């Protein structure tokens, strides 16, 4: 009559826990380097019915694991090859006057020095072209001679983004859901399970997201507590904006040996005309996607308010300017020409001037350098703008004339646009249940 | 019920079904508790080994805890220990056909330590009674 | 039969012996699946750890699969799965005492999956049949 307790083993019971992840890539490099195990590309996406699981961003440790993961990957590919210890020599720089324009007057410096040769008892005079963002007065020296010695970036490897999949060992699982109206943190009514994810691009940016995943149906304004102004607001696009960034310079690369078996590549003499590196976005689709964003920005605020767009707050060159990794040489782009808009109730291109830096400071630690070698030819890039990062400002009076500004500088927000669906859970197979048994003695 | 209508539930598919529907799928769930990394530098050198031994130790802890209770080698094993009704005053008709194991755990998560500790004291008692009777 | 005529059978010594004669050699095979590195930096540090975990989880893979069939804790068990005339058209006298185990697995290597799937389904069939008669 009375029910007695039993033991059921292997039943699906979940528990929110964190474990280490594991890379997976398809068929050298800078992320894979033929080290990740090539997984079988069969995403076992078993849709689950009547399952409501509460997701939570900004506490998910997957984006903390991923940021920690590729920091060690960046330092792994920079160790086994040459550094640039002997470049801290006093320079003799002069302005480049070979077919220059009025705007780039003083951008390029023609510097010569007494860098050592392959023999330790001889020296050679080597001339090279350096940008004005890498040299300071003492006649000149490199901007990081008071900082630690720097690597060479070793141009046999490339910085092209490669899809990478993160998933857990046995006994764990990854849950994702495909709700079209999904916010940041809440119960999602379409939870599915998968072994691990689709292609995730590790491409680097600070202001605008590039080459990300498009939205399902509409632009989602996805952020946490919104009365606070100290937290960023993440915007995901549904219709991408095509961006073209190029540089028509005929750069020539000179290979100079610094010692035994240690080469070094520097910018040689220029050929042709000196012009800037300009990035192009169409004025039609950018105005179309700006209206589609402020339409969704009005859901969390008033209907009669005035939404204004302004440029960055200024300061450091890492956060203020647009930064990306297309073509192998880094672009730091002025981006004041996209935010000339005032939104109230009720010609096919935009030019953006850019600055090119060679001494590259990556994530906010100061002891690491990055020296991108010069590349022959003309860089031509075709990318997509699939996101935005906005930071609100305080001091708002009477909740009127409220504006949005770009910013951030934290690189963890780039991968929250890609890992907004996935979470890790721990399978607890052991459990009890009451039914009608009696153990046979 | 054939062709595209056949049952190919796979791993973790019965996590939204009822009590009696999920009890038949215990084989496929425990199949994915050891394998998955069956096919194969500092980075992912310690991460790969820490990935597996963490997973092995949890599986062994579940089997050893099952083996203490005398249910080793069985998927649906049932004992003869009474349980007090204060944990759940619900009959079998209102539990075994209309609710999911996920919401069942949170109602008895307070008493998992109590109900586990009543099992090794139960199981050792037949072995004590087996030693007295059979000698 | 003793002295120099005594047989200690070594390890893997029943590879050429017949299937009937190898039915008493099951013990010495299983004892060599875990030990060997019982007595003891990147080189030869990760190479042991990669090999030690691999030698353990494959043993657990073959032991968990035994427990799903209901064969946990036994070396020679036998179930109620009917193997049929299409798999091998030979009698028991033409299999046991005239050929060995090594090339017997080659004819069954195509039918290994169909054998393995029916055993785990048949055990769960008789678990619910035990529940009906016990209540």
């Amino acid at each position: 009559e009375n029910l007695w307790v039993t033991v059921y083993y292997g039943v699906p019971v979940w528990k929110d826990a964190e474990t280490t992840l594991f890379c997976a890539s398809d068929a050298h490099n800078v992320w894979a380097t033929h080290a990740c195990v090539p997984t079988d590309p069969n995403p076992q996406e078993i849709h689950l019915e009547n399952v409501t699981e509460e997701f939570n961003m900004w506490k998910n440790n997957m984006v903390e694991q991923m940021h920690t993961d590729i920091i060690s990957l960046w330092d792994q590919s920079l160790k086994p090859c040459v550094k640039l210890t002997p470049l801290c020599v006093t320079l003799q720089c002069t302005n480049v006057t070979n077919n220059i324009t009025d705007d780039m007057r003083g951008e390029l410096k023609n510097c010569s020095f007494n860098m050592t040769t392959e023999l330790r008892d001889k020296k050679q005079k080597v001339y090279s072209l350096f940008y004005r963002l890498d040299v300071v007065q003492i006649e000149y020296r490199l901007i990081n001679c008071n900082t630690s010695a720097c690597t060479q970036a070793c141009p046999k490897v490339s910085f092209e983004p490669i899809p990478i999949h993160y998933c857990a060992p046995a006994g764990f699982a990854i849950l994702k859901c495909k709700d079209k109206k999904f916010n940041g943190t809440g119960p999602c009514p379409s939870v599915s399970t998968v072994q691990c994810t689709h292609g995730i691009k590790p491409v680097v940016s600070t202001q605008l997201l590039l080459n990300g995943s498009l939205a399902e149906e509409e632009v989602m304004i996805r952020s946490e507590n919104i009365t606070n102004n100290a937290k960023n607001i993440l915007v995901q696009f549904n219709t991408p904006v095509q961006i073209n960034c190029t540089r028509p310079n005929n750069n020539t690369r000179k290979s100079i040996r610094i010692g035994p078996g240690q080469a070094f590549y520097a910018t040689g003499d220029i050929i042709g005309d000196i012009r800037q590196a300009h990035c192009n976005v169409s004025k039609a689709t950018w105005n179309e996607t700006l209206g589609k964003v402020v339409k969704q920005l009005r859901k969390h605020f008033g209907n009669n308010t005035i939404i204004r767009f302004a440029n960055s707050s200024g300061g450091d060159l890492e956060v203020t300017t647009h930064s990306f990794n297309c073509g192998g040489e880094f672009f730091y782009c002025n981006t004041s020409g996209l935010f000339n808009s005032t939104w109230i109730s009720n010609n096919d291109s935009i030019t953006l001037p850019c600055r090119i830096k060679q001494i590259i400071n990556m994530w906010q630690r100061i002891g690491q350098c990055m020296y991108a070698p010069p590349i022959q030819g003309v860089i031509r890039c075709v990318s997509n703008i699939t996101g935005l990062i906005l930071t609100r400002d305080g001091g708002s009076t009477n909740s009127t004339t409220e504006t949005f500004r770009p910013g951030g500088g934290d690189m963890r927000d780039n991968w929250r646009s890609e890992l907004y669906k996935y979470k890790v859970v721990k399978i607890e197979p052991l459990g009890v249940a009451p039914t009608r048994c009696k153990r046979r003695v | 019920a054939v062709g595209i209508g056949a049952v190919f539930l796979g791993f973790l598919g019965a996590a939204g079904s009822t009590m009696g529907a999920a009890s038949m799928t215990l084989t496929v769930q425990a199949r994915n508790l050891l394998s998955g990394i069956v096919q194969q530098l500092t980075v992912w050198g310690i991460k790969q080994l820490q990935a597996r031994v963490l997973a092995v130790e949890r599986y062994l802890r579940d089997q050893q805890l099952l083996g203490i209770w005398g249910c080793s080698g069985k998927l649906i094993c049932c004992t003869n220990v009474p349980w007090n009704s204060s944990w759940s005053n619900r009959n079998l008709s209102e539990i075994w056909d209309n609710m999911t194991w996920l919401q069942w755990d949170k109602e008895i998560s307070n008493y998992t330590q109590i109900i586990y500790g009543l099992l090794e004291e139960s199981q050792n008692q037949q072995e004590k009674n087996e030693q007295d009777l059979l000698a | 039969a003793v002295g120099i005529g005594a047989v200690f059978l070594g390890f893997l010594g029943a590879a050429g012996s017949t299937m009937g004669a190898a039915s008493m050699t099951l013990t010495v095979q299983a004892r060599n699946l875990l030990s060997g590195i019982v007595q003891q930096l990147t080189v030869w540090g990760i190479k042991q750890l990669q090999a030690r975990v691999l030698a353990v989880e494959r043993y657990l893979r073959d032991q968990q699969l035994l427990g799903i069939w209901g064969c946990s804790g036994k070396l020679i068990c036998c179930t109620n799965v009917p193997w049929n005339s299409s798999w091998s058209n030979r009698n028991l006298s033409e299999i046991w005492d005239n050929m060995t185990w090594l090339q017997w697995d080659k004819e069954i290597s195509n039918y290994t999956q169909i054998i393995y799937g029916l055993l785990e389904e048949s055990q769960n069939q008789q678990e619910k049949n035990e529940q009906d008669l016990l209540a």
Epitope: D40, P41, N42 | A1, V2, G3, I4, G5, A6, F8, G10 | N110, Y111, Q113, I114, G117
Partner: antibody
Framework: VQLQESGPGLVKPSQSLSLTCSVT?????????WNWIRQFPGKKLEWMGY???????GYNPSLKNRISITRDTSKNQFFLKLNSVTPEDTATYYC?????????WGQGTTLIVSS | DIVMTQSHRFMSTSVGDRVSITCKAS??????VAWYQQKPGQSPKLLIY???TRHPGVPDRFTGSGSGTDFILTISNVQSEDLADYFC?????????FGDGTKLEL
Amino acid sequence: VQLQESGPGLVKPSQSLSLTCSVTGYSITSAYYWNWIRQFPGKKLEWMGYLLYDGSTGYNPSLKNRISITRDTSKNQFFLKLNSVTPEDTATYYCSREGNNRSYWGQGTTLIVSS
Amino acid sequence: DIVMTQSHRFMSTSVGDRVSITCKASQSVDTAVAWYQQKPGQSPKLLIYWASTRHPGVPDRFTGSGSGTDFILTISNVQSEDLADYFCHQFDRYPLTFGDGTKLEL
């Protein structure tokens, strides 16, 4: 999943027809049904037979014993052999994947049965 | 051997007219009937499952109904993208069986 058929595009009458389906993106030892389906001239479909992940074989009775279907699990490929061919068996042969209300087909290949 | 018989082979229609396709089963087995859509040069695509429900991405203009031995698929407000071959089937017991197929003309 991607499926790709391969094999000789010309087979002499009364001889045997062999085709290979190369599968990528999914493992043939896990689930669902793996079928061969052909389309005749005039846009008619006839199901010949299937396979399961566990190696079981089934065939359309109209084809009698003319069909053996076999696989190689190391290469993740499965195979069609058709004995005693006739010119009325000329058709475009597909290997298709079915189950759980999913349906994926290869691009198909053309074969002509003539001397 | 459940035999799936379709009414006719080719029928002419105009854009904006309701069109109904019919399939007659030899036995009254179940409601587990599926329709597939096949455009020229493409593989067939599953459209309706369990005779009355719509698949993800399928437009609302596609409906189906019927039971027993009689099952009716109705297209309403035909556009250019509905040019295709449609097939009734049964998915209860082996052997699988196909209709003869119906081709739409505009």
